Ligand binder design. Structure first.
Ligand code: QGM
Lengths: 406, 354, 51, 49
């Protein structure tokens, strides 16, 4: 029994690093290293998946993303191809809600948290600053859909801060000038914005056009917004979140291969490891080892990688990971705290807030105006057409005192 | 071109009868029907053959049917759909009987009914025989939130027992069994175990009647023994649909879509050259005209689909597990209307008054 | 305004001033607005001033 | 046994037995019936011996 393992990566030198990883795994079953690069036109990759790897006897696969801006079409061909057999696989990179759910893809596990869960930090970011009123902006994509889902569900479960309005919109928008108008005239003053990158200008340059960033204002966005605007048009003082892994597949390899090794030790007790069916053409045989391999990888806890305590959630992404509480310094970047799994850990610096005051502004202003409406009902409501001057004529009661009219 | 694939162990040679029915009329652009069948072929073989043949014979539209090797095949072209921008039609097979949502950057609607449609037909059956109360339990099968939301909304315009999702809590959940009618939205593999536990707790014969959707049994012939000697199910596929009739429906759909296309602004789907490289990605950026290929008619009825893939008001039938462990066509369904050609199914008095 | 199904399967909406309160248009109602159970699940009522 | 225990409807439950069988019967009770806050068990003298 020599369980060969296959990988696909974007940098061949780090594929050699993966060969070092499989040597260290030989230091520890029996492994054999094999791997393939990636090319454009994902149909060629859906060829090479079995033209190279599925042609062998594989019980776990490695997948990672390129730098190309596809970022969604990159993991799917291999995903579909292997999934035909329910083969557990390990993703290493961009964590959009591709296989966030078990519906399309079945037994995939990843090492990077998907941009959804960054909501929860915001949640406790509230329980730090006692804010209980909140505006939310979301575009009606699947990413933002799940975003609203997770956020509203967590907040309702918190029953405290209650949501105020779920303002949805569309990606392809040149101007959201109409929506921010009704937005920035409501009660609260804290705003969360999770959408695609280039939307930020569409928001930001529209916000300052409405001066929606001057003072009595607080913002909170996702990392894509941070990058795309903190280079382009970030209104200073806005706050976001930052992840530690960033863009490098190296440490992911370490996080990955260790649990791959620790797995095979969980079926060296009953010899139900019969054979991974080599070759794509030839059999619709369901390698029913898949459910067992998945149920065990869902709990193969280790501490191999650079980051201690790399484990899984019920989704198979990075669980109990670590973020850094990013912040901007009017053109510059800093970390003023490391959110450690669940710990409330800030860090010392000049924590500015929009406009540039060392105070933490309150939630709401509680305006003095109140739009009131009412219906036509003679014995409770009398309406009269105005006079030629623009009012309606005064009159006295039978007692002689005046009567109000508005 | 407009091609057809008929991989599977069947009467494909006979089914080419529909070639002349295609050859005479109902084709403005007269198409090039051509079969490329296969054996029990693997996903990768399926992909390479599909794009290779679509590239060779100059194909611009396709429809296929096969043995129910796995529902995953429905997913497998969802990728290539936008990868080459061409209408796809899964038909006549359990392979093409599952739902595949949210891939809608491209084509490939399907046939048969929707979750909502079949569910409303279940409710229609429930009224037409006055079954007042109902219970329901299900699992993580696709459409659980959809089903619970649909049934919780269509009751605010019933006599439910309870909605239950399952994962020693099984018995404490089954103890709430209170309805005179029991429902389940599942498949046969788990249905074995669930009818087992049902015999373990719930009644099976005279005292309860089991009703389930089309894709619980999948095919039409197998039967795990734990099922009661009666099952009200609903489908259309393998009881009236002739394969030549189905492929005729398909070629009609594509030809009338081509009619709408060449009429609106007179653009033919450009021939995708290669399934290989970025030089073929040149046409991949050309215009897309998918939507307006959906309001077209022939053989009388309209064939409008929603933006997701299901036709409106399908033609449907209701079957029942008889005593010989077989199914029988007992209910007609047409034009959002039901016809139950069989009364209550075996304290039995018959009263009379004036 | 009352709860009414709209788009024939889509939503349940309030067809009037009650909705205008829930929609975000209004902020307070003063009119002979009735009190019952159905409305009480989305509004907050002062004590009644005129039986 | 289960089809009989399904008629469990009372807020108070009685049994006239002895300890040896009482082991198995409280076992099946946990298997079906509630045990803590929700039911109170009363039994005669010669159940525990
Ligand atoms: O019946 C109606 N509108 C209607 C108008 C034309 C045709 C049919 C019905 N309104 C009712 C309901 C609503 C209320 O809060 O009670 N306004 C309101 C206020 C008062 Cl003072 C008395 C009543 Cl009954 C009503």
């Amino acid at each position: 029994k020599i369980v060969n393992i296959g990988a696909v990566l974007s940098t061949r030198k780090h594929e050699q690093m993966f060969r070092e990883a499989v040597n260290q795994a030989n230091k520890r079953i029996q492994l054999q290293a094999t791997s393939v690069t990636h090319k454009p036109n994902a149909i060629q990759m859906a060829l090479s998946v079995c033209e190279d790897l599925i042609s062998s006897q594989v019980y776990a696969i490695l997948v990672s993303h390129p730098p190309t801006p596809n970022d969604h079409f990159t993991p799917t061909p291999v995903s579909y191809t292997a999934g035909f057999y329910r083969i557990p696989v390990l993703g290493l990179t961009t964590r959009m809600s591709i296989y966030s759910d078990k519906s399309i893809h079945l037994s995939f596990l990843r090492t990077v948290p998907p941009y959804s869960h960054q909501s929860s930090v915001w949640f406790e970011m509230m329980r730090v600053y006692n804010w209980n009123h909140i505006i939310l902006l979301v575009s009606d994509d699947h990413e933002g859909r799940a975003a609203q889902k997770r956020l509203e569900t967590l907040l309702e479960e918190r029953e405290g801060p209650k949501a105020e309005k779920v303002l949805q919109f569309d990606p392809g928008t040149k101007n959201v000038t109409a929506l921010l108008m009704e937005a920035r005239e409501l009660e609260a003053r804290v705003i969360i914005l999770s959408a695609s990158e280039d939307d930020a200008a569409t928001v930001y340059r529209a916000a300052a056009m409405l001066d929606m960033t001057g003072s009595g204002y607080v913002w909170l966005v996702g990392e894509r917004e941070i990058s795309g605007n903190a280079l382009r048009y970030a209104p200073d003082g806005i706050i976001g979140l930052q992840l530690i892994n960033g863009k490098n597949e190296s440490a992911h390899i370490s996080d990955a291969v260790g649990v791959v090794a620790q797995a095979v030790h969980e079926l060296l007790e009953k010899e139900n490891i019969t054979d991974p069916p080599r070759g794509c053409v030839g059999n619709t045989n369901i390698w029913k080892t898949g459910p067992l391999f998945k149920r065990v990888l869902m709990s193969s806890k280790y501490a191999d990688g650079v980051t201690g305590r790399v484990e899984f959630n019920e989704d198979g992404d990075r669980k109990f990971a670590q973020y850094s509480i990013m912040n901007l310094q009017n053109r510059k970047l800093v970390q003023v705290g490391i959110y450690n799994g669940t710990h409330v850990i800030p860090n010392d610096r000049k924590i500015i807030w929009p406009g540039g005051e060392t105070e933490k502004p309150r939630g709401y202003q509680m305006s003095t105006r109140l739009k009131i409406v009412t219906i036509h009902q003679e014995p409770f409501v009398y309406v009269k057409p105005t006079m030629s001057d623009g009012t309606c004529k005064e009159e006295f009661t039978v007692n002689g005192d005046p009567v109000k009219k508005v | 071109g407009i091609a057809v694939i008929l991989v599977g162990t069947s009467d494909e040679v006979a089914i080419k009868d529909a070639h002349e029915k295609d050859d005479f009329h109902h084709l403005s652009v007269v198409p090039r029907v051509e079969l490329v069948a296969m054996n029990e072929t693997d996903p990768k073989s399926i992909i390479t053959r599909i794009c290779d043949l679509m590239s060779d014979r100059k194909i611009q539209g396709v429809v296929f049917a096969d043995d129910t090797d796995q529902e995953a095949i429905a997913q497998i072209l969802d990728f290539i759909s936008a990868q080459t921008l061409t209408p796809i039609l899964g038909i006549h097979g359990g392979s093409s009987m599952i739902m595949a949502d949210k891939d809608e950057s491209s084509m490939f609607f399907q046939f048969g009914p929707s979750i909502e449609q079949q569910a409303s037909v279940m409710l229609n059956i429930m009224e037409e025989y006055d079954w007042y109360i109902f219970s329901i339990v299900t699992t993580y099968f696709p459409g659980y939130q959809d089903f619970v939301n649909k049934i919780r909304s269509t009751i605010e315009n019933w006599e439910l027992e309870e909605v239950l999702l399952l994962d020693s809590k099984i018995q404490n959940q089954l103890k709430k069994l209170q309805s005179p009618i029991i429902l389940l939205y599942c498949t046969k593999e788990e249905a074995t175990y669930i009818f087992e536990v049902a015999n373990s707790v719930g009644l099976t014969g005279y005292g309860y009647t089991w009703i389930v959707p089309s894709l619980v049994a999948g095919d039409t012939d197998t039967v795990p023994s734990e099922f009661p000697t009666g099952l009200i199910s609903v489908s259309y596929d393998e009881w009236d649909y002739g394969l030549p009739a189905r492929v005729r429906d398909g070629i009609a759909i594509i030809t009338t879509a081509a009619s709408d296309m060449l009429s609106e602004h007179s653009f033919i789907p450009e021939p995708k050259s290669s399934c290989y490289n970025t030089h073929e990605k040149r046409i991949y950026q050309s215009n897309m005209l998918n939507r307006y290929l959906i309001n077209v008619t022939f053989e009388g009825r309209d064939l409008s689909f929603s933006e997701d893939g299901y036709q409106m008001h399908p033609k449907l039938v209701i079957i029942l597990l008889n005593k010989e462990r077989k199914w029988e066509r007992v209910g007609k369904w047409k034009d959002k209307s039901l016809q139950m050609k069989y009364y209550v199914w075996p304290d039995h008095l018959s009263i009379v008054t004036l | 305004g009352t709860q009414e199904r709209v788009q024939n399967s889509n939503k349940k909406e309030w067809n009037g001033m009650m909705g205008e309160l829930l929609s975000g248009q209004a902020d307070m109602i003063v009119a002979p607005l009735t009190i019952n159970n159905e409305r009480a699940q989305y509004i907050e009522f002062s004590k009644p001033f005129k039986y």
